[PDB]
Protein backbone atom coordinates (compact mmCIF):
# COMPACT_ATOMS: atom_id res chain seq x y z
CA UNK A 1 0.00 0.00 0.00
CA UNK A 2 1.75 3.25 -1.10
CA UNK A 3 1.10 6.62 0.61
CA UNK A 4 -1.94 7.85 -1.36
CA UNK A 5 -3.65 4.43 -1.07
CA UNK A 6 -3.27 4.17 2.76
CA UNK A 7 -6.60 3.84 4.55
CA UNK A 8 -7.92 3.04 8.00
CA UNK A 9 -8.29 -0.75 7.45
CA UNK A 10 -4.60 -0.96 6.53
CA UNK A 11 -3.49 1.22 9.44
CA UNK A 12 -5.62 -0.73 11.91
CA UNK A 13 -4.85 -4.29 10.62
CA UNK A 14 -2.56 -6.74 12.28
CA UNK A 15 -2.54 -10.52 12.70
CA UNK A 16 -1.42 -10.10 16.30
CA UNK A 17 -4.91 -8.86 17.31
CA UNK A 18 -7.37 -11.03 19.30
CA UNK A 19 -11.06 -10.33 18.91
CA UNK A 20 -13.12 -9.92 22.15
CA UNK A 21 -16.91 -10.24 21.80
CA UNK A 22 -18.69 -8.04 24.30
CA UNK A 23 -21.85 -10.14 23.83
CA UNK A 24 -20.06 -13.06 25.47
CA UNK A 25 -19.50 -11.17 28.72
CA UNK A 26 -21.79 -11.43 31.70
CA UNK A 27 -23.09 -8.33 33.46
CA UNK A 28 -21.91 -8.30 37.07
CA UNK A 29 -24.59 -7.93 39.72
CA UNK A 30 -24.68 -4.99 42.14
CA UNK A 31 -23.28 -7.37 44.77
CA UNK A 32 -20.35 -8.45 42.53
CA UNK A 33 -19.58 -4.82 41.56
CA UNK A 34 -19.43 -3.95 45.27
CA UNK A 35 -17.18 -6.99 45.91
CA UNK A 36 -14.77 -5.96 43.12
CA UNK A 37 -14.75 -2.39 44.48
CA UNK A 38 -13.74 -3.45 48.05
CA UNK A 39 -10.93 -5.53 46.51
CA UNK A 40 -9.61 -2.35 44.84
CA UNK A 41 -9.70 -0.30 48.05
CA UNK A 42 -8.34 -3.12 50.26
CA UNK A 43 -5.23 -3.63 48.09
CA UNK A 44 -1.90 -3.82 49.96
CA UNK A 45 1.47 -2.94 48.38
CA UNK A 46 2.65 -5.47 45.81
CA UNK A 47 -0.73 -7.11 45.22
CA UNK A 48 -2.77 -7.49 42.05
CA UNK A 49 -6.48 -7.49 41.22
CA UNK A 50 -7.46 -9.74 38.33
CA UNK A 51 -10.88 -8.80 37.02
CA UNK A 52 -12.92 -11.77 35.74
CA UNK A 53 -14.37 -11.36 32.27
CA UNK A 54 -17.61 -9.38 32.52
CA UNK A 55 -19.27 -5.95 32.40
CA UNK A 56 -19.13 -3.88 35.61
CA UNK A 57 -21.53 -0.89 35.74
CA UNK A 58 -21.08 2.15 37.97
CA UNK A 59 -18.03 1.28 39.96
CA UNK A 60 -17.93 5.01 40.81
CA UNK A 61 -15.03 6.57 42.69
CA UNK A 62 -12.25 3.97 43.01
CA UNK A 63 -9.28 5.25 45.13
CA UNK A 64 -6.04 3.20 44.86
CA UNK A 65 -3.67 4.16 47.71
CA UNK A 66 -1.45 1.05 47.45
CA UNK A 67 1.96 1.12 45.72
CA UNK A 68 3.32 -1.49 43.28
CA UNK A 69 -0.07 -2.83 42.36
CA UNK A 70 -1.49 -4.10 39.07
CA UNK A 71 -5.16 -4.05 38.20
CA UNK A 72 -5.73 -6.11 35.05
CA UNK A 73 -8.40 -7.92 33.01
CA UNK A 74 -8.25 -11.68 33.32
CA UNK A 75 -8.31 -11.75 29.59
CA UNK A 76 -7.13 -8.51 27.96
CA UNK A 77 -10.11 -6.50 26.69
CA UNK A 78 -12.69 -8.59 28.54
CA UNK A 79 -13.23 -6.47 31.68
CA UNK A 80 -15.67 -3.74 30.48
CA UNK A 81 -16.20 -0.89 32.95
CA UNK A 82 -19.40 0.93 32.19
CA UNK A 83 -21.55 3.73 33.65
CA UNK A 84 -19.70 6.18 35.90
CA UNK A 85 -16.17 5.35 37.14
CA UNK A 86 -12.91 7.07 38.04
CA UNK A 87 -9.75 5.26 39.08
CA UNK A 88 -8.00 7.76 41.32
CA UNK A 89 -4.41 6.43 41.38
CA UNK A 90 -2.75 7.90 44.49
CA UNK A 91 0.00 5.30 45.01
CA UNK A 92 3.24 4.99 43.07
CA UNK A 93 3.96 2.27 40.49
CA UNK A 94 0.29 1.40 39.90
CA UNK A 95 -0.40 -0.32 36.52
CA UNK A 96 -3.85 -0.56 34.91
CA UNK A 97 -3.69 -3.24 32.19
CA UNK A 98 -6.20 -4.58 29.62
CA UNK A 99 -9.28 -2.56 30.70
CA UNK A 100 -12.19 -1.31 28.66
CA UNK A 101 -14.04 1.92 29.37
CA UNK A 102 -17.29 2.16 27.39
CA UNK A 103 -21.01 2.89 27.65
CA UNK A 104 -20.50 5.32 30.54
CA UNK A 105 -18.27 8.26 31.42
CA UNK A 106 -15.82 9.67 34.00
CA UNK A 107 -17.12 9.97 37.56
CA UNK A 108 -15.18 13.22 37.92
CA UNK A 109 -14.06 15.55 35.08
CA UNK A 110 -10.35 14.72 35.19
CA UNK A 111 -11.09 11.31 33.66
CA UNK A 112 -11.76 7.57 33.98
CA UNK A 113 -8.09 7.42 35.07
CA UNK A 114 -6.49 10.10 37.29
CA UNK A 115 -2.77 9.15 37.44
CA UNK A 116 -1.80 11.05 40.59
CA UNK A 117 1.20 8.95 41.74
CA UNK A 118 4.67 8.50 40.30
CA UNK A 119 5.47 5.71 37.90
CA UNK A 120 1.77 5.19 37.12
CA UNK A 121 0.96 3.23 33.91
CA UNK A 122 -2.10 2.74 31.78
CA UNK A 123 -1.54 0.04 29.18
CA UNK A 124 -3.38 -2.28 26.71
CA UNK A 125 -6.66 -0.52 27.46
CA UNK A 126 -9.50 0.72 25.30
CA UNK A 127 -11.87 3.66 25.59
CA UNK A 128 -14.82 3.32 23.27
CA UNK A 129 -17.14 6.34 23.11
CA UNK A 130 -16.94 6.97 26.85
CA UNK A 131 -19.15 10.06 26.53
CA UNK A 132 -22.14 9.16 28.68
CA UNK A 133 -23.95 9.31 32.01
CA UNK A 134 -22.42 12.51 33.33
CA UNK A 135 -24.38 15.81 33.21
CA UNK A 136 -23.64 17.72 30.03
CA UNK A 137 -25.30 21.08 29.71
CA UNK A 138 -24.38 24.69 28.82
CA UNK A 139 -23.64 26.39 32.13
CA UNK A 140 -25.61 29.36 33.55
CA UNK A 141 -22.61 31.78 33.58
CA UNK A 142 -21.94 31.62 29.86
CA UNK A 143 -23.55 28.51 28.26
CA UNK A 144 -20.16 26.70 28.41
CA UNK A 145 -20.31 22.85 28.21
CA UNK A 146 -18.16 21.05 30.80
CA UNK A 147 -14.73 19.72 29.86
CA UNK A 148 -14.42 16.00 30.72
CA UNK A 149 -11.06 14.32 30.16
CA UNK A 150 -10.49 10.60 29.75
CA UNK A 151 -6.97 10.30 31.23
CA UNK A 152 -5.07 12.86 33.31
CA UNK A 153 -1.47 12.71 34.57
CA UNK A 154 -0.58 14.74 37.65
CA UNK A 155 2.56 12.89 38.80
CA UNK A 156 5.98 12.02 37.39
CA UNK A 157 7.20 9.34 35.03
CA UNK A 158 3.71 8.32 33.85
CA UNK A 159 3.28 5.96 30.95
CA UNK A 160 0.23 5.78 28.69
CA UNK A 161 1.16 3.11 26.16
CA UNK A 162 -0.49 0.64 23.77
CA UNK A 163 -4.02 1.90 24.36
CA UNK A 164 -6.87 2.67 22.03
CA UNK A 165 -8.77 5.91 22.52
CA UNK A 166 -11.72 5.79 20.19
CA UNK A 167 -14.69 8.17 19.77
CA UNK A 168 -14.21 11.09 22.18
CA UNK A 169 -17.20 13.23 21.12
CA UNK A 170 -17.97 15.51 24.02
CA UNK A 171 -15.92 18.54 25.12
CA UNK A 172 -12.56 18.20 26.91
CA UNK A 173 -9.00 17.12 26.06
CA UNK A 174 -8.75 13.27 25.81
CA UNK A 175 -5.41 13.16 27.77
CA UNK A 176 -4.40 16.11 30.00
CA UNK A 177 -1.07 16.59 31.76
CA UNK A 178 -1.38 18.77 34.88
CA UNK A 179 2.17 19.50 36.03
CA UNK A 180 4.18 21.56 38.53
CA UNK A 181 7.51 23.41 38.25
CA UNK A 182 9.83 20.42 37.63
CA UNK A 183 10.17 18.00 34.64
CA UNK A 184 7.52 15.27 34.39
CA UNK A 185 9.12 12.86 31.95
CA UNK A 186 5.88 11.24 30.89
CA UNK A 187 5.75 8.79 27.93
CA UNK A 188 2.65 8.71 25.77
CA UNK A 189 3.57 6.23 23.06
CA UNK A 190 2.29 3.47 20.75
CA UNK A 191 -1.41 4.42 21.19
CA UNK A 192 -4.21 4.51 18.69
CA UNK A 193 -6.48 7.62 18.69
CA UNK A 194 -9.56 7.61 16.46
CA UNK A 195 -12.64 9.64 15.70
CA UNK A 196 -12.54 12.49 18.12
CA UNK A 197 -14.98 15.17 16.89
CA UNK A 198 -16.99 18.12 18.16
CA UNK A 199 -20.55 19.36 17.88
CA UNK A 200 -22.24 15.97 17.99
CA UNK A 201 -24.66 17.22 20.64
CA UNK A 202 -25.58 20.64 19.21
CA UNK A 203 -22.99 22.44 21.26
CA UNK A 204 -22.22 24.92 18.49
CA UNK A 205 -25.91 25.99 18.16
CA UNK A 206 -25.31 28.50 20.90
CA UNK A 207 -23.66 30.97 18.54
CA UNK A 208 -22.44 33.49 21.23
CA UNK A 209 -20.55 30.72 22.99
CA UNK A 210 -18.85 29.13 19.94
CA UNK A 211 -15.24 30.32 20.43
CA UNK A 212 -14.92 28.57 23.77
CA UNK A 213 -17.40 25.70 23.22
CA UNK A 214 -15.44 24.86 19.99
CA UNK A 215 -12.19 24.90 22.02
CA UNK A 216 -10.75 22.19 24.33
CA UNK A 217 -11.21 19.06 22.17
CA UNK A 218 -7.50 18.17 21.90
CA UNK A 219 -6.21 14.57 21.77
CA UNK A 220 -3.61 15.60 24.36
CA UNK A 221 -2.70 18.79 26.19
CA UNK A 222 0.73 18.77 27.84
CA UNK A 223 0.82 21.48 30.55
CA UNK A 224 -1.33 24.58 30.78
CA UNK A 225 -0.89 28.36 30.63
CA UNK A 226 0.10 28.68 34.34
CA UNK A 227 2.70 25.90 34.11
CA UNK A 228 3.84 26.75 30.61
CA UNK A 229 7.08 28.53 31.41
CA UNK A 230 8.45 25.32 33.02
CA UNK A 231 9.74 22.12 31.43
CA UNK A 232 7.66 18.99 31.20
CA UNK A 233 10.27 16.99 29.17
CA UNK A 234 7.41 14.63 28.14
CA UNK A 235 7.22 12.52 24.98
CA UNK A 236 4.32 12.00 22.62
CA UNK A 237 5.88 9.46 20.25
CA UNK A 238 5.00 6.66 17.78
CA UNK A 239 1.23 7.10 18.07
CA UNK A 240 -1.35 6.52 15.34
CA UNK A 241 -4.06 9.11 14.94
CA UNK A 242 -6.96 8.59 12.52
CA UNK A 243 -9.76 11.03 11.79
CA UNK A 244 -8.99 13.15 14.85
CA UNK A 245 -10.96 16.33 14.10
CA UNK A 246 -11.63 17.66 17.60
CA UNK A 247 -10.48 21.28 17.13
CA UNK A 248 -7.70 23.38 15.62
CA UNK A 249 -5.18 21.78 18.05
CA UNK A 250 -4.67 18.03 17.74
CA UNK A 251 -1.87 18.09 20.29
CA UNK A 252 -1.60 21.26 22.41
CA UNK A 253 1.84 21.69 23.95
CA UNK A 254 1.73 24.15 26.85
CA UNK A 255 5.14 23.55 28.61
CA UNK A 256 8.77 23.13 27.63
CA UNK A 257 11.34 20.58 26.41
CA UNK A 258 8.76 18.17 24.98
CA UNK A 259 9.22 15.68 22.12
CA UNK A 260 6.34 15.21 19.64
CA UNK A 261 7.92 12.79 17.18
CA UNK A 262 7.40 9.80 14.91
CA UNK A 263 3.58 9.90 15.03
CA UNK A 264 1.38 9.04 12.04
CA UNK A 265 -1.51 11.47 11.80
CA UNK A 266 -3.96 10.34 9.14
CA UNK A 267 -6.97 12.37 7.83
CA UNK A 268 -7.02 14.43 11.05
CA UNK A 269 -8.48 17.93 10.70
CA UNK A 270 -6.42 19.28 13.63
CA UNK A 271 -2.77 20.45 13.87
CA UNK A 272 0.18 19.79 16.18
CA UNK A 273 0.16 23.06 18.12
CA UNK A 274 3.12 24.50 20.03
CA UNK A 275 0.77 26.75 21.95
CA UNK A 276 2.83 27.87 25.03
CA UNK A 277 6.28 27.01 26.35
CA UNK A 278 9.79 26.80 24.97
CA UNK A 279 12.26 24.44 23.31
CA UNK A 280 9.82 21.77 21.97
CA UNK A 281 10.87 19.46 19.13
CA UNK A 282 8.53 18.11 16.44
CA UNK A 283 10.40 15.56 14.37
CA UNK A 284 9.96 12.55 12.03
CA UNK A 285 6.19 12.70 12.01
CA UNK A 286 4.13 11.46 9.02
CA UNK A 287 1.17 13.71 8.61
CA UNK A 288 -1.00 12.23 5.86
CA UNK A 289 -4.03 14.46 5.27
CA UNK A 290 -5.21 12.26 2.36
CA UNK A 291 -6.89 15.32 0.77
CA UNK A 292 -9.31 15.73 3.68
CA UNK A 293 -10.58 19.28 4.29
CA UNK A 294 -8.84 21.30 7.04
CA UNK A 295 -5.95 18.88 7.58
CA UNK A 296 -2.57 20.42 8.34
CA UNK A 297 0.82 19.96 10.00
CA UNK A 298 2.16 22.18 12.77
CA UNK A 299 1.32 25.65 14.10
CA UNK A 300 3.81 27.58 16.22
CA UNK A 301 3.90 30.13 19.07
CA UNK A 302 6.71 30.86 21.55
CA UNK A 303 10.45 30.25 21.37
CA UNK A 304 13.39 27.98 20.60
CA UNK A 305 11.47 25.13 18.89
CA UNK A 306 12.91 22.66 16.38
CA UNK A 307 10.74 21.42 13.51
CA UNK A 308 12.78 18.78 11.65
CA UNK A 309 12.36 15.93 9.18
CA UNK A 310 8.58 15.80 9.10
CA UNK A 311 6.76 14.45 6.07
CA UNK A 312 3.49 16.33 5.51
CA UNK A 313 1.39 15.32 2.53
CA UNK A 314 -1.94 16.01 0.79
CA UNK A 315 -3.20 18.50 3.34
CA UNK A 316 -6.01 21.02 2.51
CA UNK A 317 -7.61 24.26 3.69
CA UNK A 318 -6.46 27.50 5.28
CA UNK A 319 -9.15 28.95 7.49
CA UNK A 320 -10.81 27.05 10.34
CA UNK A 321 -14.61 27.34 10.64
CA UNK A 322 -14.69 29.19 14.01
CA UNK A 323 -13.33 32.76 13.75
CA UNK A 324 -11.37 34.68 16.35
CA UNK A 325 -9.15 31.76 17.46
CA UNK A 326 -6.22 32.44 15.05
CA UNK A 327 -7.14 29.15 13.34
CA UNK A 328 -4.90 29.40 10.27
CA UNK A 329 -3.88 26.06 8.82
CA UNK A 330 -1.27 24.70 6.43
CA UNK A 331 1.73 22.37 6.55
CA UNK A 332 3.80 24.54 8.89
CA UNK A 333 2.23 27.83 10.23
CA UNK A 334 4.37 30.53 11.87
CA UNK A 335 1.65 32.30 13.90
CA UNK A 336 1.61 36.04 14.63
CA UNK A 337 1.50 36.90 18.30
CA UNK A 338 0.84 39.90 20.53
CA UNK A 339 4.28 40.69 21.94
CA UNK A 340 7.35 42.37 20.49
CA UNK A 341 9.81 39.46 20.90
CA UNK A 342 12.30 41.17 18.51
CA UNK A 343 12.76 43.66 21.41
CA UNK A 344 12.70 40.98 24.13
CA UNK A 345 9.04 41.35 25.19
CA UNK A 346 7.62 38.31 27.13
CA UNK A 347 4.17 37.17 28.23
CA UNK A 348 3.88 37.86 31.92
CA UNK A 349 1.08 37.10 34.25
CA UNK A 350 1.39 40.64 35.81
CA UNK A 351 1.11 42.51 32.56
CA UNK A 352 -2.50 43.14 31.72
CA UNK A 353 -3.45 41.90 28.23
CA UNK A 354 -0.14 39.93 27.93
CA UNK A 355 -0.81 37.12 30.43
CA UNK A 356 0.66 33.60 30.06
CA UNK A 357 -2.54 32.29 28.37
CA UNK A 358 -2.18 34.80 25.49
CA UNK A 359 -0.10 34.52 22.25
CA UNK A 360 3.70 34.50 22.39
CA UNK A 361 5.09 35.66 19.00
CA UNK A 362 7.38 32.86 17.79
CA UNK A 363 11.12 33.44 17.93
CA UNK A 364 14.30 31.46 17.17
CA UNK A 365 12.55 28.57 15.40
CA UNK A 366 14.63 26.03 13.45
CA UNK A 367 12.65 24.57 10.52
CA UNK A 368 14.81 22.11 8.64
CA UNK A 369 14.67 19.13 6.31
CA UNK A 370 10.88 18.88 6.12
CA UNK A 371 9.13 17.50 3.03
CA UNK A 372 5.73 19.04 2.30
CA UNK A 373 4.16 17.17 -0.63
CA UNK A 374 0.96 18.33 -2.33
CA UNK A 375 0.05 20.69 0.55
CA UNK A 376 -2.59 23.25 -0.57
CA UNK A 377 -1.09 25.73 1.94
CA UNK A 378 2.55 24.74 2.57
CA UNK A 379 4.67 26.96 4.85
CA UNK A 380 2.32 29.75 5.91
CA UNK A 381 3.67 32.94 7.42
CA UNK A 382 0.98 34.05 9.84
CA UNK A 383 -1.33 37.05 9.58
CA UNK A 384 -3.87 36.25 12.30
CA UNK A 385 -5.71 38.82 14.36
CA UNK A 386 -6.08 37.91 18.10
CA UNK A 387 -8.93 38.59 20.54
CA UNK A 388 -8.41 39.53 24.20
CA UNK A 389 -9.59 36.12 25.43
CA UNK A 390 -11.81 33.16 24.49
CA UNK A 391 -14.60 35.08 26.30
CA UNK A 392 -13.82 38.66 25.26
CA UNK A 393 -14.21 39.27 21.53
CA UNK A 394 -12.35 42.65 21.36
CA UNK A 395 -9.34 42.58 18.97
CA UNK A 396 -5.90 43.13 20.39
CA UNK A 397 -4.02 46.03 18.85
CA UNK A 398 -0.34 45.38 18.27
CA UNK A 399 0.35 42.17 16.31
CA UNK A 400 3.86 40.86 15.51
CA UNK A 401 5.43 38.45 12.97
CA UNK A 402 7.76 35.58 13.79
CA UNK A 403 11.37 36.47 14.50
CA UNK A 404 14.67 34.64 13.76
CA UNK A 405 12.95 31.85 11.86
CA UNK A 406 15.73 29.77 10.27
CA UNK A 407 14.64 27.68 7.26
CA UNK A 408 17.10 25.09 5.91
CA UNK A 409 16.88 22.16 3.40
CA UNK A 410 13.04 22.13 3.25
CA UNK A 411 11.32 20.83 0.16
CA UNK A 412 7.82 22.09 -0.64
CA UNK A 413 6.74 20.01 -3.61
CA UNK A 414 3.55 21.20 -5.31
CA UNK A 415 4.70 19.97 -8.74
CA UNK A 416 1.45 18.00 -9.01
CA UNK A 417 -0.84 21.05 -8.62
CA UNK A 418 1.43 24.11 -8.84
CA UNK A 419 -1.51 26.48 -8.26
CA UNK A 420 -1.35 25.36 -4.63
CA UNK A 421 0.52 27.80 -2.35
CA UNK A 422 3.84 26.27 -1.34
CA UNK A 423 4.98 29.26 0.74
CA UNK A 424 2.56 31.98 1.90
CA UNK A 425 4.66 35.09 2.70
CA UNK A 426 2.90 38.36 3.36
CA UNK A 427 3.92 42.02 3.42
CA UNK A 428 1.22 42.50 6.04
CA UNK A 429 3.50 40.66 8.51
CA UNK A 430 7.05 40.30 7.18
CA UNK A 431 9.15 37.85 9.16
CA UNK A 432 11.95 39.58 11.07
CA UNK A 433 15.45 38.12 10.76
CA UNK A 434 14.32 35.07 8.77
CA UNK A 435 17.10 33.06 7.00
CA UNK A 436 16.95 30.67 4.00
CA UNK A 437 19.52 27.98 3.31
CA UNK A 438 19.08 25.59 0.32
CA UNK A 439 15.28 25.80 0.30
CA UNK A 440 13.30 24.25 -2.60
CA UNK A 441 9.78 25.59 -3.21
CA UNK A 442 7.78 24.30 -6.18
CA UNK A 443 4.35 25.92 -6.65
CA UNK A 444 2.91 29.38 -5.84
CA UNK A 445 4.94 31.59 -3.50
CA UNK A 446 2.96 34.72 -2.39
CA UNK A 447 4.96 37.96 -1.75
CA UNK A 448 8.02 35.98 -2.87
CA UNK A 449 10.12 39.16 -2.94
CA UNK A 450 10.25 38.81 0.90
CA UNK A 451 12.37 35.67 0.59
CA UNK A 452 16.14 35.99 0.09
CA UNK A 453 16.46 32.97 -2.22
CA UNK A 454 15.14 29.56 -2.95
CA UNK A 455 15.33 27.03 -5.73
CA UNK A 456 12.34 26.17 -7.96
CA UNK A 457 13.96 23.00 -9.29
CA UNK A 458 13.29 19.72 -7.50
CA UNK A 459 16.33 17.59 -6.94
CA UNK A 460 16.23 13.92 -8.14
CA UNK A 461 13.08 12.33 -6.75
CA UNK A 462 13.01 8.63 -5.86
CA UNK A 463 10.15 6.70 -4.24
CA UNK A 464 11.71 4.85 -1.24
CA UNK A 465 8.99 2.54 0.28
CA UNK A 466 6.09 4.80 -0.83
CA UNK A 467 7.61 8.07 0.36
CA UNK A 468 9.19 10.76 -1.89
CA UNK A 469 12.87 11.05 -1.21
CA UNK A 470 14.52 14.22 -2.57
CA UNK A 471 18.22 13.88 -3.27
CA UNK A 472 20.16 15.64 -0.53
CA UNK A 473 17.19 17.80 0.69
CA UNK A 474 13.91 17.49 2.52
CA UNK A 475 12.99 14.81 5.06
CA UNK A 476 15.43 11.89 5.17
CA UNK A 477 13.15 8.90 4.49
CA UNK A 478 15.45 6.70 6.56
CA UNK A 479 14.09 8.37 9.73
CA UNK A 480 10.39 7.98 8.72
CA UNK A 481 7.95 5.12 8.95
CA UNK A 482 4.17 4.73 9.04
CA UNK A 483 2.86 3.61 12.45
CA UNK A 484 0.21 0.85 12.18
CA UNK A 485 -1.58 -1.45 14.64
CA UNK A 486 1.42 -3.78 14.19
CA UNK A 487 2.96 -1.75 16.96
CA UNK A 488 0.31 0.79 18.06
CA UNK A 489 -2.62 0.21 20.35
CA UNK A 490 -3.63 -2.83 22.44
CA UNK A 491 -3.37 -6.51 21.50
CA UNK A 492 -7.15 -6.98 20.88
CA UNK A 493 -10.09 -5.43 19.07
CA UNK A 494 -13.66 -5.29 20.49
CA UNK A 495 -16.96 -6.44 18.88
CA UNK A 496 -20.57 -5.65 19.70
CA UNK A 497 -19.68 -2.26 21.19
CA UNK A 498 -22.16 0.59 21.40
CA UNK A 499 -21.36 4.28 20.80
NA1 LIG B 1 -7.38 24.15 22.06
- CA of 249 from ligand 1 middle (Å) equals 5
- CA of 112 from ligand 1 middle (Å) equals 21
Superfamily (CATH) of domain 3-495:
Single-stranded right-handed beta-helix, Pectin lyase-like (2.160.20.10)
- CA of 487 from ligand 1 middle (Å) equals 28
Q: What sign for the dihedral angle of Cα 395, 400, 401, 402?
A: negative
- CA of 367 from ligand 1 middle (Å) equals 23
230 CB contacts (<8 Å, ≥6 apart)? 179, 180, 181, 182, 223, 255, 256, 277
Question: What's the CA gap between 114 and 154, in Å, rounded?
Answer: 8
Resolution in A: 1.8
- CA of 220 from ligand 1 middle (Å) equals 10
Question: What's the CA gap between 228 and 301, in Å, rounded?
Answer: 12
- CA of 89 from ligand 1 middle (Å) equals 26
Experimental method: X-ray
User: Which segments of 6-84 does DSSP mark as H helices, in order?
Assistant: 8-12, 30-41
- CA of 132 from ligand 1 middle (Å) equals 22
DSSP letter at 40 equals H
- CA of 246 from ligand 1 middle (Å) equals 9
Chain centroid offset of residue 259 CA:
12
- CA of 325 from ligand 1 middle (Å) equals 9
- CA of 41 from ligand 1 middle (Å) equals 36
Question: What's the CA gap between 88 and 93, in Å, rounded?
Answer: 13
Could you tell me which of 289, 284, 335, 321 has the C-alpha nearest to residue 306? 284
Question: What's the CA gap between 262 and 239, in Å, rounded?
Answer: 7
Question: What's the CA gap between 365 and 368, in Å, rounded?
Answer: 10
- CA of 9 from ligand 1 middle (Å) equals 29
- CA of 256 from ligand 1 middle (Å) equals 17
Contact between 251 and 275 (Cβ < 8 Å): no
36-47 burial by CB neighbour count: b if 16+ within 10 A, else e?
bbeebeebeeee
- CA of 251 from ligand 1 middle (Å) equals 8
- CA of 360 from ligand 1 middle (Å) equals 15
Neighbouring-strand partners of residue 177: 153, 222
- CA of 172 from ligand 1 middle (Å) equals 9
- CA of 151 from ligand 1 middle (Å) equals 17
Q: Give CA separation, 231 vs 43, 191, 227, 278, in Å.
A: 34, 23, 8, 8
363 CB contacts (<8 Å, ≥6 apart)? 302, 303, 304, 341, 342, 402, 403, 404
Q: Give CA separation, 462 vs 50, 281, 321, 469, in Å.
A: 52, 27, 37, 5
What residues does each domain of the chain span? 3-495
Could you tell me which of 271, 351, 353, 269 has the C-alpha nearest to residue 310? 271
- CA of 253 from ligand 1 middle (Å) equals 10
68 CB contacts (<8 Å, ≥6 apart)? 45, 46, 91, 92, 93, 94
- CA of 266 from ligand 1 middle (Å) equals 19
Contact between 14 and 484 (Cβ < 8 Å): yes
- CA of 149 from ligand 1 middle (Å) equals 13
Amino acid sequence: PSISEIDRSYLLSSDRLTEVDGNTLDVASEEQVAALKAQFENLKDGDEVVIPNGKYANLGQVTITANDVTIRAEQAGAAWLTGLIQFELKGDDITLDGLVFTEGGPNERFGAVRMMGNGNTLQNSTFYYFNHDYTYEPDERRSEYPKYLWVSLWGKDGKVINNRFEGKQKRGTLIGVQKDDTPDNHLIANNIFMDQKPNQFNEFDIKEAIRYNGNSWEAIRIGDSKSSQWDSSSKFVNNLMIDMDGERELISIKSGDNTISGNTIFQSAALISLRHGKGNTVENNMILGNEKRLTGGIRIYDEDHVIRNNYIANTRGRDGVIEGNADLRGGIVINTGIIDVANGEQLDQSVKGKELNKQWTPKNITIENNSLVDTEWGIVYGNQSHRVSLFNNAEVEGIYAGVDIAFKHNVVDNSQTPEFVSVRATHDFPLVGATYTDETYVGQVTDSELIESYSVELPKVTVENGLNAYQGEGADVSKLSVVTAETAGPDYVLENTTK
